[PDB]
Structures are given as structure tokens and as C-alpha cells.
Amino acid sequence: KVGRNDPCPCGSGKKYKQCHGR
Ligand SMILES: [Zn+2]
């Protein structure tokens, strides 16, 4: 589990909930 509130690990710029996270 990751802190969706943190910039996606992919390194795109958007947070999980905004990127891969969702
Ligand atoms: Zn991503």
C-alpha cells in the first residue's frame, strides 16, 4: 500500500489517486 497523497512512484508528476493509484 502507498500513500496516494504522494506523487506517483512512476515519476510523472501526479499523485497516485490522480495517476496509477486510480
Ligand atoms: Zn503514475
The CA distances from residue 10 to 4, 14, 18, in Å, are 12, 9, 12
CA atoms of 18 and 22, how far apart (whole Å) = 6
Question: 15: CA distance to ligand 1 center in Å?
Answer: 7
CB 19 within 8 Å of CB 10: yes
Tell the burial category of 5 from Cβ atoms under 10 Å away from its Cβ (0-12, 13-18, 19+). exposed
Q: Please give the distance, rounded to the nearest whole angstrom, from the Cα atom of residue 2 to the centre of ligand 1.
A: 12
For the record, the C-alpha cell of 15 comes out as 499523485
Identify the H or E element spanning 19. none
Please name the residues in contact with 12: beta carbons below 8 A apart, sequence gap of 6 or more.
19
Ligand 1 ion: residues within 5 Å (CB): 8, 10, 12, 19-20
Scanning the structure block, which residue is given the C-alpha cell 489517486? 17
Distance from residue 1's CA to the centre of ligand 1 (Å):
14
Distance 6 CA to ligand 1 centre (A): 11
Instruction: Please name every residue paired with 15 in a beta bridge, in sequence order, or none if there are none.
Output: 7
Check residue 2 and report its DSSP letter. Answer: -
Q: How far is CA 7 from CA 15, 22, in A?
A: 4, 12
Could you say which DSSP state residue 7 is in? B
